[PDB]
């Protein structure tokens, strides 16, 4: 009964305020409006044409995803990935797509973050969840962390601060990995040493690897498996070294068949799916957004328009795919009880 | 005849006593807006900076050059607020310092030139405030990216006439490589201040650069961890050379004939998030005068050493005006 009720119930924080779990609907759990650096969009909007051009591009892309069935995206851009929650709020209002914002730290923390203690980082993550991001009053609904191989000492502090902020607030944790180095195993160990439940943790970029034994072992432990870069592929771009390095030479079909593989092995309840798409991208080579748009014009609509029909004709039931894209994110994003 | 400040253009005569290398807040891009509680609050940081700049004003300072770049967390709206409430002119900087994020590190020399030009010719962010100086940095031999920054800085200077000021590891003679790259872009040494030059005792390094026409930034005079020997992080940052040793380098360059090429400053801050947490309190504990240290302590020290008042006025008024005036 309660799956049909939207006018009441517990709530998820978005850039427009709280929404009921029922209102979240079809949710992409790992996306970006703009992948940049702190302060960069405000200091150099002409890099993106203009701020107005970036807004219009993102609103059009979100409307395309909405027409394909998407109702919510989780923008997992952190402070150091150039998250501008005022941009997120504007595009969310114009496109009528819910956007959950993130705290945490990604791969490019400045000195003012890298010098901080685990206790200090915990306070910063709590600030963005409990008080608001900058002076906007927009509260983060997820904590994003990253490793690229064995964690640096600072990344260990970030992982522990994320776990502590998660336990204190009930909001979940989502991660960036070098999946080929099995990063999720060390991340899980650090999280478990802090007492975090695996059901509150998504191990991301997990479709970057073909090692099913690594994925199934984490899923068996209760971790959520983020198969979040399905359209990332440089097939056809083999002469472009920067695009090939970023997007890989594995096909979207290969990535999508990892979804089916985990389903077939009984782990559908542990899967989250996304595009890891962007509408602007300044933290890499200059032409990269144009290159990416050239091989995936559907943008964030790729999951509903391409991956769902592909898996359905492979025999995955529609209700299973709805469970992965609607119910699984709702359980993940719903805040659990705070500790104590 | 005009210099851009955070309150708009001023004439050269209005700059007066100028501190050429200072910071309202040494931070990181976006950090002051995302975590103002690190500084107590934004309001507390404003009040502290206004109290400190008012003290420097009472000691005779009329202008400071805030050489915080984008990646040092420059917030020009903060600079404007503090400048207005302390009635001290503040010149803002473009360029890049020692902590550029990916969105900067991945850019070409052409792209960096466009960004520096934007901040000088159009404005910083959406504020309309235009930079009056370009700040660059090396820490020993330049990285490939720092070479691009130095070249883009030279190109932006040649297009606008605003000068270039540098951060160096003086002990590794970085001013020589900076000079070489600047001259390979056709930049005139008289448009360049080689900063942190008081961090070294090698007078022959400094006089050779000045004999080539460079301005010499003796800009960290109160930086000293004397008395803080049990503090490893403060000692590493501030050094164990005394302020008197640094100040006597001013006299030495005057005595060697370079008074017209010396720029003096404190390299002080009112907030500081890019190092260890307690560093601002530690620094305030040994230099409560803050930015007033140059006028209150260094000027009388040099006067009693025999430096004429006209020479000290030339260093603190004439040289910054000549340096900051766009060519
Ligand atoms: C900023 C964004 O760009 C990449 C495509 C992937 C990421 O998720 O690591 O972050
Ligand atoms: C004092 C110390 O922090 C400042 C932000 C910059 C510096 O490089 O001048 O050194
Ligand atoms: Zn990532
Ligand atoms: Zn991502
Ligand atoms: Zn410096
Ligand atoms: Zn400085």
Numbering used by the authors:
A (entry chain B): 26 to 365
B (entry chain A): 35 to 361
What did the study's authors say about this model?
The enzyme phospho­triesterase (PTE) is capable of hydrolyzing such OP compounds. Accordingly, it has been characterized from a number of bacterial sources, including Brevundimonas diminuta (Bd; formerly Pseudomonas diminuta), Flavobacterium spp. and Agrobacterium radiobacter. The present study focuses on Bd_PTE, a dimeric metallohydrolase that has a (β/α)8 TIM-barrel fold with two Zn2+ ions embedded in the active site. Carbon dioxide reacts with the side chain of Lys169 to form a carbamate functional group within the active site, which serves as a bridging ligand to the α-Zn2+ and β-Zn2+ ions, both of which are required for full catalytic activity. The buried α-Zn2+ ion is ligated to the protein via direct interactions with His55, His57 and Asp301, and the exposed β-Zn2+ ion interacts with His201 and His230.
Apo structures of the octapeptide-tagged A53 variant were obtained using three different crystallization precipitants: AS with glycerol, PEG 6000 with MPD, and PAA, which resulted in crystal structures A53_2, A53_3 and A53_4, respectively. Interestingly, the crystal structure of A53_2 has a monomer in the asymmetric unit and the dimer is formed through a crystallographic twofold axis in space group P43212, as observed in the structures of several other PTEs: A53_5, C23_2, C23_3, C23_4, C23_5, C23M_1 and C23M_2. However, A53_3 and A53_4 crystallize in space group P21 with a dimer in the asymmetric unit. The residues from the octapeptide of subunit B made contact with Trp131, Glu132, Gln173, Phe203, Ala270, Phe306, Ser308 and Tyr309 in the symmetry-related subunit A. Interestingly, although the crystals of A53_3 and A53_4 were obtained from different crystallization conditions (PEG 6000 with MPD and PAA, respectively), both crystallized in space group P21 and both retained the residual octapeptide. Since the octapeptide was only seen in crystals in space group P21, it is reasonable to assume that penetration of the residual octapeptide into the active site is space-group dependent. The presence of the octapeptide in the active site might be expected to interfere with the binding of OPs. This indeed explains why no OPs were found in crystals of A53_3 and A53_4. A53_3 crystallized in space group P21, with the residual octapeptide pointing into the active site. Additionally, an unidentified six-membered ring ligand (X3E) was observed in the active site with two O atoms, likely acting as a chelator that coordinates the two Zn2+ ions present in the active site of PTE. Interestingly, both A53_3 and A53_4, which contain X3E and AA, respectively, in their active sites, crystallized in space group P21, with the residual octapeptide pointing into their active site.
